[model samples]
Target: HMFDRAQSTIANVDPEIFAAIEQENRRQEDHIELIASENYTSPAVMAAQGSQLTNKYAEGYPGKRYYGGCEYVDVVEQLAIDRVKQLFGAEAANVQPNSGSQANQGVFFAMLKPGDTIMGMSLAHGGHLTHGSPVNMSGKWFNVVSYGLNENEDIDYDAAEKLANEHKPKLIVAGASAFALKIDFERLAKIAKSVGAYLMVDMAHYAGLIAAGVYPNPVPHADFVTTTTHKSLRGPRGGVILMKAEYEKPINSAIFPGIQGGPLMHVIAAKAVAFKEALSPEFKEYQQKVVENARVLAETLVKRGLRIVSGRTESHVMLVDLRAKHITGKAAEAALGAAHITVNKNAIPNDPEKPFVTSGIRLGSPAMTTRGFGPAEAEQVGNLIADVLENPEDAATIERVRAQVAELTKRFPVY
Candidate 1:
């Protein structure tokens, strides 16, 4: 156990920090994690992420490092690059950039100039901050035109075409953070071409689903694609870039000289291990279970009278509308947290509340599915959350749900 090793060694090294780490470990062991973008990495991944590669400083790709003593680091990094290419059908892969947000920035820096017109899904409709939220650099520096869900609470691709024609954007961004449906990459590609714009798809949230061949792939269509290794991929927290051979020079430079310096070789090593795991038969089974569990969970939530967006979920992630329940997302989030069934407050399309307090909650089944909870178990979790929301202020209800959650966690230990 990590606790056993840390308590023996780290406790003696730094009791203060070790105490906090132990508390976090207990938190994971006890809670039922439902955050749509969270997952557990394998022990092998953890080992690679914490290995001695952290001390190395390999500045460039494989054989082309500016620093010395990179022979070993080169092998690890090349393996990472090669693995991503095979996993996603990418022409080339740059396994750096540190995070999903920075990965998006890399693509933007490569194809866009300051004040150039751009289009992306809006944050209020499940898009990311890097996808042109006014407060983000992409929005602040570029002439970003935002599009979002229609009255039906799905991506208004028709309006997206309208906006593209109106502005003839330099880059058209397609992706989301809390989205509940699959995006039509080929359709979006046509829009980009008609306007002479570049297409970028941020698949950070669904890269694992795509890798398992369950969700649609964007690699064959988009000019650039970015993703995080953590979320559904179940790896360390890092980012990667994929592009055709033509843009390799600009995209590679964007990740290096344009936005970042030396890469984190240890995280890159962990990413290699993760990519390899993603290619396995076991991972395909895991991803398939994730989709099935999520669908059942969403159906169960709807049966409990909670509204899901787009009438159904086309992927692992789903959004719950809370207005009909007459409860603020902030209130429900706190209530669920009190019961150990974790979820995050999120904004629904045309949400009436502010960002800090939203009108909905987002949930996913990947983490629990990783812990071996199939559809039957996932539906029970749904019923638990529904119970707490129906009686948010009842002390007995909170205690009852907590006990059930504890039992569930015990049955499915993450480690």
Candidate 2:
């Protein structure tokens, strides 16, 4: 809806950019979004995100603001924090941090010192950039070690323990980016304890599953947890941090003057609205469907001669290695994009290819399943993907598939 307004506002300033914006919006409306980290927020959440709260300058946490006229904004922020804590069963929560990356940064700021060693999952094996990528600030400023999946493509706890003992990091972050298996939080916490490290879980990808009791809850074992309000949680673009202990002061201080200047009150308000929606029992059903749909899609793809990383998935996301099909992730992504089936190229565990041209593609079911797609629809989508990959040079077939995708999407429109 805002695309129209954006186009009007940018038409005079830059028509090219406005045209691109409109084109992207049309692409989204037509294609199927299977990116695990993306989702469509509710209209209520969008309403709050575009509300008058955006005009406010809330420079600090509730009741401790540096600026005036933050009373209402403070209420919104507090509600978001409280709802997140209740949903995750945490002692404290921080509803600020512009995104998941910033949320992780705030945790590092509050707990670990510069140059202090920290251990996290390897990005190529499912870890996030914020956890530790050489290019990211986390790795540049801290002593970061990475643990990866075992030969079976599942988290190698024994290897992780060995690495933790050797490194003796001050913090151990447990989470993933392309992992399809559930995390063993208790085991991770034990390893962190043995190494005298604070355990944190980045449940950004599976927060909704955890909330719906479909996956193991990490809050009980983790010292801190961070998640994006979007993705499986189906909220606006924002982040929330939860802690097992009463570390609100340090967390708030770290997020406020430590990392950012002023909080986005409108996003915070949207987070509050989304958290409320997640509290409903129906949301649990939605999450269950999300997982089921993912499994169906993964199974269909595997049946079509694709190698699904980790053998199969226990969550909403799966990684399909394209090496067996003699295709690169980059080329496969382009082929699927041409057919209007959207997903991103991703690195597989122990990948042989480079990051930009990965060996696999990542797929998820949260968005389509949320739009009322069932196992049948997932199966059809999987078949569409297989057909495209099999005949990458067939433009007419690709266009036919694109029209079919449009027809399917029209029956289950996101907005």
Candidate 3:
């Protein structure tokens, strides 16, 4: 009785948009997704996002709203805050910020000013653009110093410490977008402290892993921690900021008045649902499977003649170097797409190709795992990728793999 709802309202109201939505549903159902930053949210989360709360304009935090009729929304937002705080063991949490980029901007707005020196991982070295690419506000408005991976293809903590000491930055960022190895947040925190810099860990990629205790949590060591609720967290697309209790006022002000205006109450409600899901033992087991699937995927690619960056993966994502197969990431991406499998072209450490025509592909296990794919399925997906890459121009092979993809997707339906 609680789940009763109309199914064809959108189709009746707007046929074009409804048709496009149906097409996308088919696309997602037929394709195997390996994109590191994407994942499928639960139906409950989706329902919360599409609820009547979307009409509400909650301009401020719980109880301190700039609008009236905020009683129910206050509870929804508060549930998000409390559950996320418990999920990561943080003293304070801000469940606003429309996206991960906004989450970082909110922290920067609260803590730093224009031209303040900051440090983050270089984009070419597996860091996010929000971390400090020259094209982003985080870079253009701030004097940015970037750290890169070491000779072993892992974080160069020593280089980061040296840069911090030399620049005397006001902030240093930890975490990455494409890195496959574990980050030593404790050491990075020490590096930031040595230069009197505040450490901000953008744990967007590893949030669910961290929540499941499969990856290290940065909340205790960093001044700020930010994450996307999608990806491995398997929620609706949104961002959250976690910090020590002392900075609660400034962070909240920065998020509400300083950056965003009215909060996305519907998305906040969906985040609450996802956070409740993350608290379950089943969620923990799901994260464990995600990590396991990643490992198997990486190993299968390596065995099939692809070189995995950083030698191996210790988390849910990996960067696969395409040099050995003599194919550009762009070309391989297209070939894989022809076979109904999706992945993103990414730049590997010391890559010689341009960013657009990268020498690597970044793959992850979150989406497939969400759809109930296990280690064997992950390995099969990896083999499919390797097959397409290894035969970029073979029409027969592409058709064969596409047929296999259709078969696999039919067997494990996402919805």
Candidate 4:
């Protein structure tokens, strides 16, 4: 009764938006999602996110109140903070950055000044823009020395160290958006220590795997680690920063007073709920399945004549290299979408095409795996992708692929 109230009321109060929402629900249900960064939250997470707490303006942290009515929100925020620290084994945690990118922005603002030299993986090599793409603020103000995967399509830590030594960057960013390999946080940390640079790991894509102990963690080695709560974490959309207790004061101030005024109380409440979920034994099993499903998907695509960058996946994300197929990332993405399967166009390492028209498609398993797709289904999904791209001119064949997607999604409903 409680859960349906908003949709029912909105159905009458704002029929137009309600219609769009209904369409979106159908869209999500009918499609197989391969977007690495997206996941369907539990109904509990969704309900808490749309709670009445959103009406409050709790501008400051828990105990010291800036607003008059901040009692309950304080509880919610603190619960989120404690749970995230426990989950990540961090000495301190900041639960208020609005998004993962903002979490990173808070780090740059807190630790480094404008025009400081920083190093990160280049965007075309699976790193995020906040790690310092020219279009983002991180690039415009700072001296960003970009690194990349070697010709073997793996993070070239040696090269990264060389760049760090040459530039003497203030912060060395570790982690990637579309990377499918496990990173050696310890090695990166050693490099950072040797170069006297701050190591910040953005585990936004594979935070769940790390939490489950399936992947190596950066918390012990990194000076700062940031992650989005969604994705394989399967929470509401939000961000978190993990650091040693010594940096708490500066980090907190930068997040609240320096960058954002108030944390999203409702989202914080949702994050608390999600963190509780992550602590469950079932969540570990889910993440394990996510990695396996991604591996099967990548292997299937490779078997079908598509190249999986890095050759194999060690995580839930990978880039399906389409350069040899003569299918542009744009064409493959559009064709896949037409068949009711969703994936984003991405650039391969040393991609020759422009940013708008890349030569690869990035696929992820967290969302579909959340919907109960397994290695078998992922393999089938992979075949469909290769088929669609392999014959983009065949309209009838693609329509059949679309119907198959509908069939599969119906069997594994999200809501």
lDDT of each: 0.91, 0.90, 0.93, 0.91
lDDT of 3 by residue, 1-415 (tens): 3334565477766799999999999999999998988999989999999988989989988999988999999999999999999999999999999999999999999999999999999988888899888889999999999999889998888888888888899999989999999999999988888778999999999999999999999999999999999988999999999999999999999998999999999999999999999999999999999999999999999999999999999999999999989999999888998899999999888889987899998999999999999998998998989889989889999999999999899999999
* Ten residues in sequence with the least summed lDDT for candidate 1: 1-10
Q: Please give, for residues 193-258, the per-residue lDDT of candidate 4 as tens digits.
A: 998999999999989998998888899999899999988888989899999988888899899899
Output the lDDT of residue 243, model 3: 97
Best-to-worst order by lDDT is 3, 1, 4, 2
Considering summed lDDT, which 10 consecutive residues are worst modelled in model 4?
1-10
Ranking 2 against 3 by lDDT, winner? 3
- Top candidate (TM-score): 3
lDDT (10s digit) by residue, model 1, range 27-124: 98899999989999999999998888999877777888899999998989999999999999999989987998899899988888899999999887
Query: Which candidate gets the maximum lDDT versus the true structure?
Result: 3
Q: Check candidate 4 and list the clashing pairs.
A: none
Q: What is the TM-score of each candidate against the true structure?
A: 0.97, 0.94, 0.98, 0.97
Candidate 1 residue-wise lDDT at 201: 94
Residue 346's lDDT in candidate 2: 95
TM for candidate 3 is 0.98
For model 4 the TM-score comes to 0.97
The CA lDDT at 147 in model 3 is 91
